[PDB]
Amino acid sequence: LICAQKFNGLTVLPPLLTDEMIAQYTSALLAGTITSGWTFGAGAALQIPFAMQMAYRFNGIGVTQNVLYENQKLIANQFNSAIGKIQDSLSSTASALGKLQDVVNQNAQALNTLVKQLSSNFGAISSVLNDILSRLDPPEAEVQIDRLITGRLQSLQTYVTQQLIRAAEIRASANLAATKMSECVLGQSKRVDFCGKGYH
Amino acid sequence: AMQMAYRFNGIGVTQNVLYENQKLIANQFNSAIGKIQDSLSSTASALGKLQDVVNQNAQALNTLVKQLSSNFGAISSVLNDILSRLDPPEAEVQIDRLITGRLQSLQTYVTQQLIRAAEIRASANLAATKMSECVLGQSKRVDFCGKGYHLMSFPQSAPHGVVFLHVTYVPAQEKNFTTAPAICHDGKAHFPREGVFVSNGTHWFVTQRNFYEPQIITTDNTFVSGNCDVVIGIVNNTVYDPLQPELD
Amino acid sequence: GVLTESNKKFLPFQQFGRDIADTTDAVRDPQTLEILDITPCSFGGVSVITPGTNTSNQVAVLYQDVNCTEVPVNVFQTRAGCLIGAEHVNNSYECDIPIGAGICASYQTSQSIIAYTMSLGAENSVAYSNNSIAIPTNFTISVTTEILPVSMTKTSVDCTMYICGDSTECSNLLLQYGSFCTQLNRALTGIAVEQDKNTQEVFAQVKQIYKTPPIKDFGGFNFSQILPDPSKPSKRSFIEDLLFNKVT
Amino acid sequence: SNLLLQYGSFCTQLNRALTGIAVEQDKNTQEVFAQVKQIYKTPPIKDFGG
């Protein structure tokens, strides 16, 4: 499939940032968040205990600090259980990655259609340039070769336009993801239903 | 000055911090404006987003013009040649080849312009949002109007674009302390009203969270929340009371 | 192609073989009756990494996907192809020129072109502790800068003057496609009015036109760099003039 | 190839568009994840309040 497409000029460049580097970026973000609150997205990380950070955050939704310190074990248990449920929801046949999967499926279908377009006559006597070239004289073979050229160029135009539109959509979604990363992770938000469902 | 004090009180830092540090803040502001003027008046451009627009438009137009000299299959790319060099019933096919080619060119250019215009529309909506939220008011969305806590913003024009100068607040030099959640005084546990407890090593103080300015722990900086046997990390200390000295 | 030894079990009536994309990837030898595979040799594009002609005139070639054995003639096989003309070091700096798959290249010590593995940043651990807090003591005002494009150049095309010229038979032929020019002109006019609305809604957010006082007593802050100067023929401030001369 | 040279600037346009898309994808990843200049490690002690 991959090389089957590769054998017709189609290439696939590798990303500049390998997956280990992205994993290190997320690890850095998560460690900074759990060790320094939100003070590392606005300067230098200022360490602070975690219970006191969670109390700074409880105080941010109009609930006094004295409800965390007196209910710390319960909140710890609820958070651990919620993480466990997240695991049990992802570690099963519950396939909820539709956004990341439709992208791969759409790109694979686009490439499959583009490479399958190479097997149509478009009016010419064949679909292989070598055949027409080897069983027809040039001054006559020009018309067949030109029909094939126009067909293939039209199909390539269509592919490029579809890719442009998909790239615009992905750019919009990536701007949204960057905004969520910058406003939900590196600081507590107060926009309703932007960083969850409930008081963030 | 009072507007700047409002905008500080907006990001947590009290007013006295500005009112007692006005000359230093003014000097830092002027120095930053000078740094901006210097950073712009140099071979370092940084105006790539306003130059790529012009470059892409010029390139699209130049490609559309240059494609007026391609045969597309005809015997020449000059309609007058096709006309004077042939009779109509045979020049029909050549002129039709040229017409199909030029239709294709115009259509491709128009589609790419539509897509570029959608992108510029998205960018202009983002810029309108930033002008409405950062300029006309202080913002609290993190890293939306700069890098740090946002103080204000000044807009400037630019050919086919806009340029925002975001004035933001950044804490600079920190110091370590040994904090604590509460303070058990007489069975009661005194949680801090609007700050955090710290200690230089011997005594305890209550301060704010963004600018170290320590005070004495009265019954106005703290509030009690019951007995002191449930908080995890409480420490013994004496919470001063300002009434008893004067009344007695 | 590359005729290698097969591994597929043809039934004794079949001649060709095909992939999931309908092209021959196997053949039966018409003399010895043996099955062979076919792999093409169309192998990747070529990139050239250059540190700029202003700095130096040596370059490093990168073959995007080859096993470094099929190149014609300091070869280094990376994950993004084959790099010819650059030494691989074991250090790690910021990325100056991107190669792909976490590989970058820079002009550096005489001097040459090096191809390291990029680094993410200065690693530092935080001194987290269950009773240790870091409070700031002094601050810093910072004036950043953010550029945003708002609108591109408005354009318009007259088809029958671009497609055809001063020829009437060409227009009589273009009549066979009646609505294409009208579609195109409608699209371009929509784009133009969209750009005008973009500028209008980005900038025109004030009802009145306010005026700065003649006496500038702002508590120390100096806005004389961003406020307009009446001396200039136009009413652009110093920074706006510094911007309108850097974009061609 | 000689017959295709009669359509002068279509292939260059397509190559330009596709390389633009590629560099835009790299820009997307860089703008989403790379929002910290440092790399914070977590201490080997795990006393995160519970």
Side-chain angles (χ1 to χ4, degrees), chain B residues 28 37 102 121 123 125 162 164 166 168 170 172-173 175 177 212, chain C residues 133 135-138 140-142 144 146 148-149 163 198 201 225 237:
Chain B
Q28 290 183 15
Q37 170 212 334
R102 284 162 185 191
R121 175 64 166 156
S123 180
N125 286 159
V162 69
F164 289 97
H166 297 120
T168 66
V170 173
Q173 54 210 38
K175 187 192 285 183
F177 305 93
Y212 173 79
Chain C
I133 187 172
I135 301 285
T137 50
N138 194 0
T140 285
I141 313 297
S142 64
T144 76
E146 166 143 29
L148 282 152
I163 288 169
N198 281 341
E201 90 167 358
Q225 284 279 278
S237 68

PDB file of all heavy atoms in Angstrom, chain B residues 28 37 102 121 123 125 162 164 166 168 170 172-173 175 177 212, chain C residues 133 135-138 140-142 144 146 148-149 163 198 201 225 237:
ATOM      1  N   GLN B  28      11.199  51.748  33.045  1.00  0.00           N
ATOM      2  CA  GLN B  28      11.166  50.472  32.339  1.00  0.00           C
ATOM      3  C   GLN B  28      10.296  50.559  31.090  1.00  0.00           C
ATOM      4  O   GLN B  28      10.648  50.011  30.039  1.00  0.00           O
ATOM      5  CB  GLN B  28      10.669  49.370  33.272  1.00  0.00           C
ATOM      6  CG  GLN B  28      11.655  49.005  34.366  1.00  0.00           C
ATOM      7  CD  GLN B  28      11.170  47.857  35.223  1.00  0.00           C
ATOM      8  OE1 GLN B  28      10.241  47.144  34.853  1.00  0.00           O
ATOM      9  NE2 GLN B  28      11.801  47.669  36.374  1.00  0.00           N
ATOM     10  N   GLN B  37      11.630  50.326  19.194  1.00  0.00           N
ATOM     11  CA  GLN B  37      12.027  51.183  18.079  1.00  0.00           C
ATOM     12  C   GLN B  37      13.337  50.709  17.461  1.00  0.00           C
ATOM     13  O   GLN B  37      13.481  50.691  16.233  1.00  0.00           O
ATOM     14  CB  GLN B  37      12.150  52.633  18.541  1.00  0.00           C
ATOM     15  CG  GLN B  37      12.778  53.548  17.506  1.00  0.00           C
ATOM     16  CD  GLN B  37      13.576  54.675  18.126  1.00  0.00           C
ATOM     17  OE1 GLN B  37      13.309  55.095  19.251  1.00  0.00           O
ATOM     18  NE2 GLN B  37      14.563  55.174  17.392  1.00  0.00           N
ATOM     19  N   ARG B 102      -6.671  29.019 -21.374  1.00  0.00           N
ATOM     20  CA  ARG B 102      -6.775  30.253 -20.604  1.00  0.00           C
ATOM     21  C   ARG B 102      -7.924  30.193 -19.604  1.00  0.00           C
ATOM     22  O   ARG B 102      -7.829  30.766 -18.510  1.00  0.00           O
ATOM     23  CB  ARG B 102      -6.908  31.437 -21.554  1.00  0.00           C
ATOM     24  CG  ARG B 102      -5.584  31.789 -22.207  1.00  0.00           C
ATOM     25  CD  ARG B 102      -5.756  32.646 -23.443  1.00  0.00           C
ATOM     26  NE  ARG B 102      -4.480  32.864 -24.115  1.00  0.00           N
ATOM     27  CZ  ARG B 102      -4.290  33.741 -25.093  1.00  0.00           C
ATOM     28  NH1 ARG B 102      -5.296  34.488 -25.521  1.00  0.00           N
ATOM     29  NH2 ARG B 102      -3.093  33.870 -25.645  1.00  0.00           N
ATOM     30  N   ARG B 121      -9.369  36.184   5.911  1.00  0.00           N
ATOM     31  CA  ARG B 121     -10.563  36.456   6.704  1.00  0.00           C
ATOM     32  C   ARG B 121     -10.417  35.917   8.118  1.00  0.00           C
ATOM     33  O   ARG B 121     -10.766  36.596   9.090  1.00  0.00           O
ATOM     34  CB  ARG B 121     -11.790  35.850   6.026  1.00  0.00           C
ATOM     35  CG  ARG B 121     -13.074  35.980   6.823  1.00  0.00           C
ATOM     36  CD  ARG B 121     -13.460  37.432   6.982  1.00  0.00           C
ATOM     37  NE  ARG B 121     -14.831  37.608   7.452  1.00  0.00           N
ATOM     38  CZ  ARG B 121     -15.264  38.690   8.091  1.00  0.00           C
ATOM     39  NH1 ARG B 121     -14.434  39.693   8.339  1.00  0.00           N
ATOM     40  NH2 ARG B 121     -16.527  38.769   8.485  1.00  0.00           N
ATOM     41  N   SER B 123      -7.612  35.408   9.731  1.00  0.00           N
ATOM     42  CA  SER B 123      -6.630  36.235  10.426  1.00  0.00           C
ATOM     43  C   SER B 123      -7.206  37.589  10.826  1.00  0.00           C
ATOM     44  O   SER B 123      -6.908  38.093  11.913  1.00  0.00           O
ATOM     45  CB  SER B 123      -5.394  36.429   9.554  1.00  0.00           C
ATOM     46  OG  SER B 123      -4.440  37.238  10.213  1.00  0.00           O
ATOM     47  N   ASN B 125     -10.379  38.232  11.506  1.00  0.00           N
ATOM     48  CA  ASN B 125     -11.271  38.029  12.643  1.00  0.00           C
ATOM     49  C   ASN B 125     -10.481  37.873  13.936  1.00  0.00           C
ATOM     50  O   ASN B 125     -10.870  38.417  14.979  1.00  0.00           O
ATOM     51  CB  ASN B 125     -12.162  36.813  12.411  1.00  0.00           C
ATOM     52  CG  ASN B 125     -13.249  37.075  11.394  1.00  0.00           C
ATOM     53  OD1 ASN B 125     -13.798  36.148  10.801  1.00  0.00           O
ATOM     54  ND2 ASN B 125     -13.571  38.346  11.185  1.00  0.00           N
ATOM     55  N   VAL B 162      -1.844  45.068  10.846  1.00  0.00           N
ATOM     56  CA  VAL B 162      -1.862  45.805  12.102  1.00  0.00           C
ATOM     57  C   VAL B 162      -0.750  45.253  12.982  1.00  0.00           C
ATOM     58  O   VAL B 162      -0.303  44.115  12.805  1.00  0.00           O
ATOM     59  CB  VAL B 162      -3.245  45.703  12.789  1.00  0.00           C
ATOM     60  CG1 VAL B 162      -3.496  44.293  13.274  1.00  0.00           C
ATOM     61  CG2 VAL B 162      -3.376  46.704  13.917  1.00  0.00           C
ATOM     62  N   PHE B 164       0.415  45.124  17.108  1.00  0.00           N
ATOM     63  CA  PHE B 164       0.078  45.360  18.501  1.00  0.00           C
ATOM     64  C   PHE B 164       1.339  45.391  19.350  1.00  0.00           C
ATOM     65  O   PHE B 164       2.214  44.530  19.223  1.00  0.00           O
ATOM     66  CB  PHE B 164      -0.856  44.273  19.030  1.00  0.00           C
ATOM     67  CG  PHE B 164      -2.246  44.348  18.485  1.00  0.00           C
ATOM     68  CD1 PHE B 164      -2.623  43.564  17.413  1.00  0.00           C
ATOM     69  CD2 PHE B 164      -3.179  45.192  19.048  1.00  0.00           C
ATOM     70  CE1 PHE B 164      -3.898  43.626  16.914  1.00  0.00           C
ATOM     71  CE2 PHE B 164      -4.457  45.257  18.549  1.00  0.00           C
ATOM     72  CZ  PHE B 164      -4.815  44.475  17.481  1.00  0.00           C
ATOM     73  N   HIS B 166       2.120  44.918  23.081  1.00  0.00           N
ATOM     74  CA  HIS B 166       1.512  44.384  24.295  1.00  0.00           C
ATOM     75  C   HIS B 166       2.419  44.759  25.458  1.00  0.00           C
ATOM     76  O   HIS B 166       3.598  44.394  25.474  1.00  0.00           O
ATOM     77  CB  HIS B 166       1.342  42.870  24.199  1.00  0.00           C
ATOM     78  CG  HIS B 166       0.410  42.428  23.114  1.00  0.00           C
ATOM     79  ND1 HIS B 166       0.808  41.603  22.086  1.00  0.00           N
ATOM     80  CD2 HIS B 166      -0.904  42.678  22.908  1.00  0.00           C
ATOM     81  CE1 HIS B 166      -0.216  41.375  21.285  1.00  0.00           C
ATOM     82  NE2 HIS B 166      -1.267  42.016  21.761  1.00  0.00           N
ATOM     83  N   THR B 168       3.098  44.090  29.225  1.00  0.00           N
ATOM     84  CA  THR B 168       2.820  43.011  30.160  1.00  0.00           C
ATOM     85  C   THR B 168       3.761  43.092  31.355  1.00  0.00           C
ATOM     86  O   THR B 168       4.800  43.759  31.328  1.00  0.00           O
ATOM     87  CB  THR B 168       2.962  41.638  29.496  1.00  0.00           C
ATOM     88  OG1 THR B 168       4.330  41.423  29.136  1.00  0.00           O
ATOM     89  CG2 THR B 168       2.106  41.551  28.251  1.00  0.00           C
ATOM     90  N   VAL B 170       5.974  40.976  34.291  1.00  0.00           N
ATOM     91  CA  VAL B 170       6.719  39.737  34.468  1.00  0.00           C
ATOM     92  C   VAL B 170       7.445  39.785  35.808  1.00  0.00           C
ATOM     93  O   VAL B 170       8.280  40.666  36.022  1.00  0.00           O
ATOM     94  CB  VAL B 170       7.720  39.499  33.326  1.00  0.00           C
ATOM     95  CG1 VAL B 170       8.594  38.304  33.633  1.00  0.00           C
ATOM     96  CG2 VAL B 170       6.993  39.292  32.015  1.00  0.00           C
ATOM     97  N   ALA B 172      10.392  38.946  38.293  1.00  0.00           N
ATOM     98  CA  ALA B 172      11.778  38.885  37.847  1.00  0.00           C
ATOM     99  C   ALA B 172      12.671  38.039  38.744  1.00  0.00           C
ATOM    100  O   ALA B 172      13.292  37.087  38.265  1.00  0.00           O
ATOM    101  CB  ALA B 172      12.345  40.306  37.727  1.00  0.00           C
ATOM    102  N   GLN B 173      12.764  38.349  40.036  1.00  0.00           N
ATOM    103  CA  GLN B 173      13.711  37.661  40.909  1.00  0.00           C
ATOM    104  C   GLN B 173      12.985  37.168  42.149  1.00  0.00           C
ATOM    105  O   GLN B 173      12.356  37.957  42.860  1.00  0.00           O
ATOM    106  CB  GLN B 173      14.893  38.564  41.283  1.00  0.00           C
ATOM    107  CG  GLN B 173      14.525  39.900  41.894  1.00  0.00           C
ATOM    108  CD  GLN B 173      15.547  40.975  41.586  1.00  0.00           C
ATOM    109  OE1 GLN B 173      16.101  41.024  40.487  1.00  0.00           O
ATOM    110  NE2 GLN B 173      15.807  41.839  42.557  1.00  0.00           N
ATOM    111  N   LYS B 175      12.549  34.358  45.687  1.00  0.00           N
ATOM    112  CA  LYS B 175      13.231  33.982  46.916  1.00  0.00           C
ATOM    113  C   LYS B 175      12.433  32.867  47.578  1.00  0.00           C
ATOM    114  O   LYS B 175      11.202  32.845  47.487  1.00  0.00           O
ATOM    115  CB  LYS B 175      13.372  35.180  47.862  1.00  0.00           C
ATOM    116  CG  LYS B 175      14.222  34.913  49.091  1.00  0.00           C
ATOM    117  CD  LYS B 175      14.078  36.027  50.115  1.00  0.00           C
ATOM    118  CE  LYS B 175      14.840  37.269  49.697  1.00  0.00           C
ATOM    119  NZ  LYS B 175      14.761  38.335  50.732  1.00  0.00           N
ATOM    120  N   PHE B 177      10.917  30.408  50.620  1.00  0.00           N
ATOM    121  CA  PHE B 177      10.316  30.513  51.940  1.00  0.00           C
ATOM    122  C   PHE B 177       9.665  29.181  52.279  1.00  0.00           C
ATOM    123  O   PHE B 177       9.436  28.337  51.408  1.00  0.00           O
ATOM    124  CB  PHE B 177       9.266  31.630  52.011  1.00  0.00           C
ATOM    125  CG  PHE B 177       9.771  32.974  51.588  1.00  0.00           C
ATOM    126  CD1 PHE B 177       9.632  33.399  50.284  1.00  0.00           C
ATOM    127  CD2 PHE B 177      10.361  33.824  52.502  1.00  0.00           C
ATOM    128  CE1 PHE B 177      10.089  34.638  49.894  1.00  0.00           C
ATOM    129  CE2 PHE B 177      10.820  35.063  52.118  1.00  0.00           C
ATOM    130  CZ  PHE B 177      10.682  35.470  50.813  1.00  0.00           C
ATOM    131  N   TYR B 212       6.550  39.869  46.985  1.00  0.00           N
ATOM    132  CA  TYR B 212       6.826  39.636  48.396  1.00  0.00           C
ATOM    133  C   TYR B 212       6.756  40.929  49.193  1.00  0.00           C
ATOM    134  O   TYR B 212       7.620  41.801  49.062  1.00  0.00           O
ATOM    135  CB  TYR B 212       8.196  38.983  48.575  1.00  0.00           C
ATOM    136  CG  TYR B 212       8.625  38.863  50.017  1.00  0.00           C
ATOM    137  CD1 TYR B 212       8.124  37.857  50.828  1.00  0.00           C
ATOM    138  CD2 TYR B 212       9.538  39.750  50.566  1.00  0.00           C
ATOM    139  CE1 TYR B 212       8.513  37.741  52.144  1.00  0.00           C
ATOM    140  CE2 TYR B 212       9.933  39.642  51.881  1.00  0.00           C
ATOM    141  CZ  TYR B 212       9.419  38.635  52.665  1.00  0.00           C
ATOM    142  OH  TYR B 212       9.811  38.522  53.978  1.00  0.00           O
TER     143      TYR B 212
ATOM    144  N   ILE C 133       8.022  27.370  49.037  1.00  0.00           N
ATOM    145  CA  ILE C 133       7.382  28.226  48.047  1.00  0.00           C
ATOM    146  C   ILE C 133       8.344  29.336  47.650  1.00  0.00           C
ATOM    147  O   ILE C 133       9.088  29.864  48.478  1.00  0.00           O
ATOM    148  CB  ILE C 133       6.050  28.814  48.568  1.00  0.00           C
ATOM    149  CG1 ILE C 133       5.313  29.558  47.456  1.00  0.00           C
ATOM    150  CG2 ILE C 133       6.286  29.745  49.736  1.00  0.00           C
ATOM    151  CD1 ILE C 133       3.918  29.985  47.837  1.00  0.00           C
ATOM    152  N   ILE C 135       8.573  33.072  46.202  1.00  0.00           N
ATOM    153  CA  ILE C 135       7.804  34.296  45.986  1.00  0.00           C
ATOM    154  C   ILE C 135       8.692  35.304  45.268  1.00  0.00           C
ATOM    155  O   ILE C 135       9.870  35.441  45.622  1.00  0.00           O
ATOM    156  CB  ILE C 135       7.279  34.867  47.311  1.00  0.00           C
ATOM    157  CG1 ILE C 135       6.390  33.850  48.019  1.00  0.00           C
ATOM    158  CG2 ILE C 135       6.494  36.133  47.067  1.00  0.00           C
ATOM    159  CD1 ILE C 135       5.021  33.713  47.405  1.00  0.00           C
ATOM    160  N   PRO C 136       8.191  36.018  44.262  1.00  0.00           N
ATOM    161  CA  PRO C 136       9.008  37.041  43.606  1.00  0.00           C
ATOM    162  C   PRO C 136       9.214  38.247  44.508  1.00  0.00           C
ATOM    163  O   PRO C 136       8.496  38.458  45.485  1.00  0.00           O
ATOM    164  CB  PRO C 136       8.186  37.416  42.370  1.00  0.00           C
ATOM    165  CG  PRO C 136       7.281  36.259  42.153  1.00  0.00           C
ATOM    166  CD  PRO C 136       6.951  35.757  43.520  1.00  0.00           C
ATOM    167  N   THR C 137      10.217  39.050  44.157  1.00  0.00           N
ATOM    168  CA  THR C 137      10.544  40.248  44.920  1.00  0.00           C
ATOM    169  C   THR C 137      10.664  41.510  44.084  1.00  0.00           C
ATOM    170  O   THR C 137      10.455  42.600  44.626  1.00  0.00           O
ATOM    171  CB  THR C 137      11.856  40.055  45.692  1.00  0.00           C
ATOM    172  OG1 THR C 137      12.862  39.552  44.806  1.00  0.00           O
ATOM    173  CG2 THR C 137      11.662  39.077  46.833  1.00  0.00           C
ATOM    174  N   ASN C 138      11.003  41.410  42.802  1.00  0.00           N
ATOM    175  CA  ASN C 138      11.033  42.571  41.923  1.00  0.00           C
ATOM    176  C   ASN C 138      10.406  42.176  40.594  1.00  0.00           C
ATOM    177  O   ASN C 138      10.278  40.983  40.303  1.00  0.00           O
ATOM    178  CB  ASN C 138      12.466  43.075  41.740  1.00  0.00           C
ATOM    179  CG  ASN C 138      12.525  44.453  41.120  1.00  0.00           C
ATOM    180  OD1 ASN C 138      11.496  45.048  40.813  1.00  0.00           O
ATOM    181  ND2 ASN C 138      13.732  44.970  40.933  1.00  0.00           N
ATOM    182  N   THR C 140       9.241  43.368  36.223  1.00  0.00           N
ATOM    183  CA  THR C 140       9.772  43.885  34.966  1.00  0.00           C
ATOM    184  C   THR C 140       8.615  44.100  34.005  1.00  0.00           C
ATOM    185  O   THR C 140       7.828  43.179  33.766  1.00  0.00           O
ATOM    186  CB  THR C 140      10.791  42.920  34.370  1.00  0.00           C
ATOM    187  OG1 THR C 140      12.018  43.006  35.105  1.00  0.00           O
ATOM    188  CG2 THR C 140      11.058  43.259  32.917  1.00  0.00           C
ATOM    189  N   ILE C 141       8.498  45.317  33.476  1.00  0.00           N
ATOM    190  CA  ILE C 141       7.541  45.581  32.413  1.00  0.00           C
ATOM    191  C   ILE C 141       8.166  45.206  31.078  1.00  0.00           C
ATOM    192  O   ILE C 141       9.345  45.484  30.824  1.00  0.00           O
ATOM    193  CB  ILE C 141       7.113  47.056  32.434  1.00  0.00           C
ATOM    194  CG1 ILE C 141       6.769  47.492  33.856  1.00  0.00           C
ATOM    195  CG2 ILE C 141       5.934  47.278  31.523  1.00  0.00           C
ATOM    196  CD1 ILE C 141       5.601  46.751  34.454  1.00  0.00           C
ATOM    197  N   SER C 142       7.382  44.571  30.212  1.00  0.00           N
ATOM    198  CA  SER C 142       7.893  44.146  28.917  1.00  0.00           C
ATOM    199  C   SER C 142       6.903  44.518  27.825  1.00  0.00           C
ATOM    200  O   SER C 142       5.698  44.302  27.968  1.00  0.00           O
ATOM    201  CB  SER C 142       8.159  42.639  28.884  1.00  0.00           C
ATOM    202  OG  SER C 142       6.958  41.908  29.042  1.00  0.00           O
ATOM    203  N   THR C 144       6.089  43.594  24.192  1.00  0.00           N
ATOM    204  CA  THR C 144       6.287  42.670  23.083  1.00  0.00           C
ATOM    205  C   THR C 144       5.740  43.295  21.801  1.00  0.00           C
ATOM    206  O   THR C 144       5.404  44.480  21.753  1.00  0.00           O
ATOM    207  CB  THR C 144       5.632  41.326  23.385  1.00  0.00           C
ATOM    208  OG1 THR C 144       4.214  41.441  23.230  1.00  0.00           O
ATOM    209  CG2 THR C 144       5.939  40.896  24.808  1.00  0.00           C
ATOM    210  N   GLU C 146       3.325  42.054  18.128  1.00  0.00           N
ATOM    211  CA  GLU C 146       2.586  41.016  17.421  1.00  0.00           C
ATOM    212  C   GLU C 146       2.053  41.581  16.115  1.00  0.00           C
ATOM    213  O   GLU C 146       1.349  42.593  16.118  1.00  0.00           O
ATOM    214  CB  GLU C 146       1.443  40.474  18.282  1.00  0.00           C
ATOM    215  CG  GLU C 146       0.427  39.654  17.515  1.00  0.00           C
ATOM    216  CD  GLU C 146      -0.085  38.478  18.320  1.00  0.00           C
ATOM    217  OE1 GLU C 146      -0.117  38.579  19.563  1.00  0.00           O
ATOM    218  OE2 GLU C 146      -0.451  37.452  17.710  1.00  0.00           O
ATOM    219  N   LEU C 148      -0.140  41.191  12.539  1.00  0.00           N
ATOM    220  CA  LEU C 148      -1.279  40.437  12.027  1.00  0.00           C
ATOM    221  C   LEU C 148      -1.735  40.985  10.682  1.00  0.00           C
ATOM    222  O   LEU C 148      -2.007  42.185  10.562  1.00  0.00           O
ATOM    223  CB  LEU C 148      -2.439  40.474  13.022  1.00  0.00           C
ATOM    224  CG  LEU C 148      -2.342  39.548  14.230  1.00  0.00           C
ATOM    225  CD1 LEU C 148      -3.115  40.124  15.396  1.00  0.00           C
ATOM    226  CD2 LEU C 148      -2.864  38.173  13.875  1.00  0.00           C
ATOM    227  N   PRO C 149      -1.846  40.146   9.654  1.00  0.00           N
ATOM    228  CA  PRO C 149      -2.375  40.628   8.375  1.00  0.00           C
ATOM    229  C   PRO C 149      -3.887  40.758   8.428  1.00  0.00           C
ATOM    230  O   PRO C 149      -4.576  39.951   9.056  1.00  0.00           O
ATOM    231  CB  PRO C 149      -1.936  39.546   7.386  1.00  0.00           C
ATOM    232  CG  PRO C 149      -1.908  38.312   8.211  1.00  0.00           C
ATOM    233  CD  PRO C 149      -1.410  38.744   9.570  1.00  0.00           C
ATOM    234  N   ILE C 163      -8.693  36.383 -21.838  1.00  0.00           N
ATOM    235  CA  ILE C 163      -8.788  35.161 -22.633  1.00  0.00           C
ATOM    236  C   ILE C 163      -8.605  35.480 -24.111  1.00  0.00           C
ATOM    237  O   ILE C 163      -7.676  34.995 -24.766  1.00  0.00           O
ATOM    238  CB  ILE C 163     -10.132  34.459 -22.378  1.00  0.00           C
ATOM    239  CG1 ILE C 163     -10.152  33.826 -20.989  1.00  0.00           C
ATOM    240  CG2 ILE C 163     -10.383  33.407 -23.434  1.00  0.00           C
ATOM    241  CD1 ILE C 163     -11.515  33.359 -20.564  1.00  0.00           C
ATOM    242  N   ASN C 198     -13.335  43.513   6.027  1.00  0.00           N
ATOM    243  CA  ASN C 198     -12.309  43.121   6.987  1.00  0.00           C
ATOM    244  C   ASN C 198     -11.640  44.340   7.595  1.00  0.00           C
ATOM    245  O   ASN C 198     -11.557  44.475   8.822  1.00  0.00           O
ATOM    246  CB  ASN C 198     -11.268  42.230   6.310  1.00  0.00           C
ATOM    247  CG  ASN C 198     -11.739  40.813   6.158  1.00  0.00           C
ATOM    248  OD1 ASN C 198     -12.662  40.386   6.843  1.00  0.00           O
ATOM    249  ND2 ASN C 198     -11.109  40.072   5.256  1.00  0.00           N
ATOM    250  N   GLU C 201     -14.087  46.365   9.858  1.00  0.00           N
ATOM    251  CA  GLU C 201     -14.451  45.813  11.155  1.00  0.00           C
ATOM    252  C   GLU C 201     -13.253  45.628  12.070  1.00  0.00           C
ATOM    253  O   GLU C 201     -13.435  45.545  13.289  1.00  0.00           O
ATOM    254  CB  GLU C 201     -15.181  44.479  10.989  1.00  0.00           C
ATOM    255  CG  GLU C 201     -14.275  43.267  10.965  1.00  0.00           C
ATOM    256  CD  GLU C 201     -15.044  41.970  11.110  1.00  0.00           C
ATOM    257  OE1 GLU C 201     -16.282  42.031  11.263  1.00  0.00           O
ATOM    258  OE2 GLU C 201     -14.415  40.893  11.069  1.00  0.00           O
ATOM    259  N   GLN C 225       6.445  58.419  21.256  1.00  0.00           N
ATOM    260  CA  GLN C 225       6.897  57.555  20.175  1.00  0.00           C
ATOM    261  C   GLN C 225       5.755  56.918  19.400  1.00  0.00           C
ATOM    262  O   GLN C 225       5.950  56.540  18.242  1.00  0.00           O
ATOM    263  CB  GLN C 225       7.808  56.456  20.726  1.00  0.00           C
ATOM    264  CG  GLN C 225       9.202  56.926  21.073  1.00  0.00           C
ATOM    265  CD  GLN C 225      10.095  57.015  19.858  1.00  0.00           C
ATOM    266  OE1 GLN C 225      10.659  56.015  19.415  1.00  0.00           O
ATOM    267  NE2 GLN C 225      10.224  58.215  19.305  1.00  0.00           N
ATOM    268  N   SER C 237       2.530  58.154  13.382  1.00  0.00           N
ATOM    269  CA  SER C 237       3.517  58.299  14.440  1.00  0.00           C
ATOM    270  C   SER C 237       4.865  57.757  13.976  1.00  0.00           C
ATOM    271  O   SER C 237       5.038  57.323  12.836  1.00  0.00           O
ATOM    272  CB  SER C 237       3.047  57.589  15.704  1.00  0.00           C
ATOM    273  OG  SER C 237       3.037  56.187  15.520  1.00  0.00           O
TER     274      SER C 237
END
